[PDB]
Structure formats: structure tokens, C-alpha cells
């Protein structure tokens, strides 16, 4: 018997319900300070889910945790990062992603991708791709790039555990899933091509050997290993990973090299895959920007303090990223020269774009001085 439809229970229930509302405040978690005009559903469903006490900036609870680690490490604590703020709950993802819209959007991408592949194979459009680009550059080097995305994904494991608020945790996990999705989409592209071109080997053996032993990815692999396993400050991981390394090396490899060149060598397939990785990069950027610039670098009480650490980290990881790009440009020696694209002038402009965009998007925001021409020369030394 369901109380909603059973005539007798429904009657009993109707008798117990008062004929007036006992309060008029119907806005779920009405006390959350809205970032925009009115409270959004994203804020309502996400904010204050984390039960922080008052001794962790912004928390509404009190007292110590009920159970801590052996030795005394708190469930969540201030010792987890160098950065400080007056409120750890302040962050808002500009895209307002709670779980539902996040999977909804990715689901659209999942299903459309499969319709696109069935049609692409029926079209026979792989017929005009440059076979060298396909066999030597795409299969091997694009394949090896999946490990960088995968290392960035893995870097988020400790962040997911250690970060200090619910909005941050959501931003970090979605960022992680998008990174592993990028790695799986690269592998999906390689497996798809293997079905079309007899003899094309989609196994990861070669790409793995290239990521771990090829000088072209040596600096990238070293930096990713460091970001993932060499540190635990969760803010350092996110900043270094997305705002420095991925914003310079990753943007260069994905956009300036594999996507741009695919449209120089007649590759009509790859741009469908990088369209996704690049859309994920920009969505992730909006959130990372809110966390580091609006919330932390501009904290009214700790902004200068935080900029001190953000500037220190940037100097260190930018040097690593420049070294990684220095090694990576050695890949241009294996491709057909194309003026304005793979020649010295082409690479140089691709580098000005990457560093020039990075300066506006990140550096200028935290007060980090950077000489774009010097960074371009630093990398061109590897050309």
C-alpha cells in the first residue's frame, strides 16, 4: 500500500497535514551568499555540503573532528596547503556545474562521437590523410601524449582527498575526469584508425616507449611526474598542473602542434577529437581562474601572501614547462617543412601565441613578470 494512492492511508495522511505552511522560507539554503544576482541551483546543491568547523576558514561547524589519523592529522586541515583565505567556500565554477549538467553535456559528446565515427568510416574520408603524418606522427607521438593527460588526471587523486571545500572539490574532480577522458579519446582515435587501415597498430606499446624513453617527451614526463607525485599541497598541484604546465606545454602540443598541423596535412579526423580536449581546457580554465585569481590572489586579507607563493611556484614550474617545450620542438625535425607552419618562423609564432596568451590569461593576473620573447628564444634553442 502506497500512502499516496491507497484510499485509506491517503485519507489518514490528509487528516494529519496542517492546512497552512509552518514557515515561508522555501529557498533551500537561503543563507548562502550568492555570487551572482540570485542564488543559483548550483550553489544551493553544492555549498556547505563540506562539514568544516570554524577553525577552517569559512566553516559553520565547531569542535574537533571525531576521528583523526594516527599521530593527529585532522580529517581536513590548514596544514594541507600554504595558501590562506578568509573563506574556503568562496569559489564558484563559472559554468555552475553540479553533477547533472556535467554528465548531461559529456553524454551529448559521447553519443555524437559514435554517430560521427560511423559516418566518417562510411564516408571513407581517411583516404586523403597524409600517410606519414598518420603512421609516424599521429600514431606514435599523439599516442604518447595520452600519458601526459593521464599523469595530469592522476595528479588530482590527492587533491580530491585533501581540498578544503565542496565547490573546489567539484571543480577538481571534473577537471580530473576531463583529463582521463582526453587520454581515452586519444586511444579511441587510434583504435578507430586501426579498423580502417590494415596494419595500423593501435597497441600502446610504442606510444608508451616514446613517452618513457624518447627525448621529445623527456621534459614533459619529468614535470608531470613532479606535479603528480612530488608534491601534496593541493593548491600547488592545481596551479602547476592547469595554470602553468597544461596552459603552456599542453596548449602548445594539443592546439599548436597536433590540431593545427592536422589541418596542414589533410587530417580530417583528429580535429574532431581535439575540439573536445580544447573545449574541456577552456571550461576548466574558467574554474581554475576563479579559484586562483578571484578567490586567492585577490583575497582581501591574504592576497599578497598568496601571490608570493603563486609567483614562486610559477617561476619553478614555468622553467620546467619551458624545458619540456624545448625538448618537444625536436619533433618538428620529423615533419615535412611547411612555411608559416613547421618552419622556424611558424614555430616562433606558435610560441608567441602560447606564451602571449598565457601572459594575459594568468601571469598578468598574479603579478608575475614574464618576457615573452625570452621564453620563445629559450624554447627555439631546441628547434
Residues that bind a copy of itself (CB under 8 A): 4-5, 7-8, 10-11, 14, 105, 107-109, 111-112, 115-116, 118-120, 122-125, 127-128, 255, 259-260, 262-268, 271-272, 275, 278-279, 281-283, 285, 341, 353, 357
Q: Is 208 in the site for another protein (CB under 8 A)?
A: yes
The interface mask with another protein, positions 338-367, x = CB under 8 A, is -------------------x----------
Residue 27 near which of a copy of itself, another protein, none (CB within 5-8 Å, type-dependent): another protein
Pairwise CA distance, residues 125 & 193, whole Å? 11
Cα 289–Cα 295–Cα 297 angle in degrees, nearest 5: 80
Among a copy of itself, another protein, none, residue 246 binds (CB under 5-8 Å by kind): none
Of 68 and 337, nearer to another protein (C-beta) is 68
Stretch that binds another protein, among 232-240, 264-272, 332-340, 375-383 (CB under 8 A): 232-240
According to CB under 8 A, which residues from 115 to 144 bind another protein? 117-119, 121-124
Q: From the list a copy of itself, another protein, none, which binds 260 (C-beta under 5 to 8 Å, kind-based)?
A: a copy of itself
> To 10 degrees, the CA torsion angle through 142, 147, 150, 155?
-130
Alpha helix stretches (DSSP H) within 214-263: 218-229, 234-238, 251, 260-262
Which residue from 378, 149, 87 is spatially nearest to 274, judged by alpha carbons? 149
Produce one character per residue of 178-214: b if its CB has 16 or more CB atoms within 10 Å, e if not. bbbbbbebbebbbebbeebbeebebebeebeebbeeb
- Would residue 72 be called left, alpha or beta, if left means φ above 0 and alpha means ψ between -120 and 50 degrees? left
Residue from 72, 300, 340, 381 touching another protein (CB under 8 A): that is 72
281 binds, among another protein, a copy of itself, none (CB under 5 to 8 A by kind): a copy of itself
Calculate Rg over the CA atoms of the chain: 25
Q: Rule CB under 8 A: is residue 92 a binding residue for another protein?
A: no
Half-sphere exposure of 180 (CA within 13 A, CB side): 10
- In the list 141, 150, 239, 265, the residue contacting another protein (rule: CB under 8 A) is 150
Backbone φ, ψ for residue 178 (5° rounding): -65, -40
Quote the CA–CA distance of 94 and 106 in Å, as a whole number. Answer: 17
Only one of the segments 146-154, 239-247, 262-270, 371-379 lies at the binding site for another protein (rule: CB under 8 A); that segment is 146-154
**Mask 154-173, x = binds another protein (CB under 8 A)?**
x-xxxxxxx---x--xx--x
Instruction: Provide, rounded to whole angstroms, the least separation between the CB of residue 311 and another protein.
Output: 8
- The span from the CA of 330 to the CA of 334, in Å, is 8
Kindly tell me which residue out of 34, 36, 114, 344 binds another protein, with binding defined by CB under 8 A: 114
181 binds, among a copy of itself, another protein, none (CB under 5 to 8 A by kind): another protein
Selection from 261, 135, 273 nearest residue 207 by Cα: 135
* CB 383 to another protein: min, Å: 26
DSSP state of 128: G
Tell me how far apart the alpha carbons of residues 161 and 58 are, in angstroms, rounded to a whole number. 19
Segment near another protein (CB under 8 A); pick from 134-142, 174-182, 244-252, 369-377: 174-182
Amino acid at each position: 500500500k502506497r500512502g499516496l494512492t491507497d484510499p485509506e492511508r491517503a485519507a489518514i495522511i490528509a487528516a494529519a497535514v496542517p492546512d497552512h505552511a509552518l514557515d515561508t522560507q522555501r529557498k533551500y539554503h537561503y543563507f548562502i551568499q550568492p555570487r551572482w544576482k540570485p542564488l543559483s541551483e548550483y550553489e544551493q546543491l553544492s555549498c556547505y555540503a563540506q562539514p568544516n568547523p570554524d577553525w577552517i576558514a569559512g566553516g559553520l561547524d565547531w569542535g574537533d573532528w571525531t576521528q583523526k589519523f594516527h599521530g593527529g592529522r585532522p580529517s581536513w586541515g590548514n596544514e594541507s596547503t600554504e595558501l590562506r583565505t578568509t573563506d574556503w567556500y568562496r569559489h564558484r565554477d563559472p559554468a555552475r556545474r553540479w553533477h547533472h549538467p556535467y554528465v548531461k553535456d559529456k553524454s551529448e559528446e559521447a553519443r555524437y562521437t559514435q554517430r560521427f565515427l560511423a559516418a566518417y568510416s562510411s564516408e571513407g574520408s581517411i583516404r586523403t590523410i597524409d600517410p606519414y603524418w598518420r603512421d609516424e606522427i599521429l600514431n606514435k607521438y599523439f599516442g604518447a601524449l595520452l600519458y601526459s593527460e593521464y599523469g595530469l588526471f592522476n595528479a588530482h587523486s590527492s587533491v580530491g582527498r585533501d581540498c578544503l571545500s565542496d565547490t573546489i572539490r567539484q571543480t577538481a574532480v571534473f577537471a580530473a575526469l576531463d583529463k582521463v577522458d582526453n587520454a581515452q579519446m586519444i586511444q579511441m582515435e587510434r583504435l578507430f584508425i586501426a579498423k580502417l587501415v590494415p596494419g595500423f597498430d593501435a597497441s600502446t606499446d610504442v606510444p608508451k616507449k616514446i613517452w618513457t624513453t624518447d627525448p621529445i617527451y623527456s621534459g614533459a614526463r619529468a614535470t608531470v611526474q613532479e606535479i603528480w607525485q612530488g608534491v601534496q599541497d593541493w593548491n600547488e598541484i592545481l596551479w602547476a598542473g592547469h595554470a602553468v604546465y597544461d596552459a603552456t606545454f599542453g596548449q602548445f602540443a594539443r592546439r599548436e602542434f597536433f590540431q593545427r598541423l592536422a589541418t596542414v596535412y589533410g587530417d580530417t579526423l583528429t580535429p574532431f577529437f581535439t575540439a573536445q580536449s580544447q573545449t574541456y581546457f577552456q571550461t576548466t580554465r574558467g574554474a581554475i581562474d576563479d579559484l586562483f585569481v578571484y578567490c586567492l590572489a585577490n583575497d582581501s586579507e591574504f592576497g599578497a601572501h598568496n601571490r608570493t607563493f603563486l609567483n614562486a611556484w610559477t617561476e619553478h614550474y614555468l622553467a620546467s614547462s619551458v624545458a619540456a617545450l624545448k625538448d618537444f620542438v625536436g619533433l618538428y625535425a620529423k615533419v615535412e617543412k611547411v612555411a608559416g607552419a613547421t618552419d622556424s618562423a611558424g614555430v616562433s609564432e606558435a610560441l608567441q601565441r602560447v606564451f602571449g596568451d598565457w601572459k594575459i590569461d594568468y601571469a598578468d593576473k598574479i603579478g608575475f613578470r614574464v618576457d615573452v620573447d625570452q621564453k620563445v628564444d629559450a624554447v627555439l634553442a631546441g628547434y
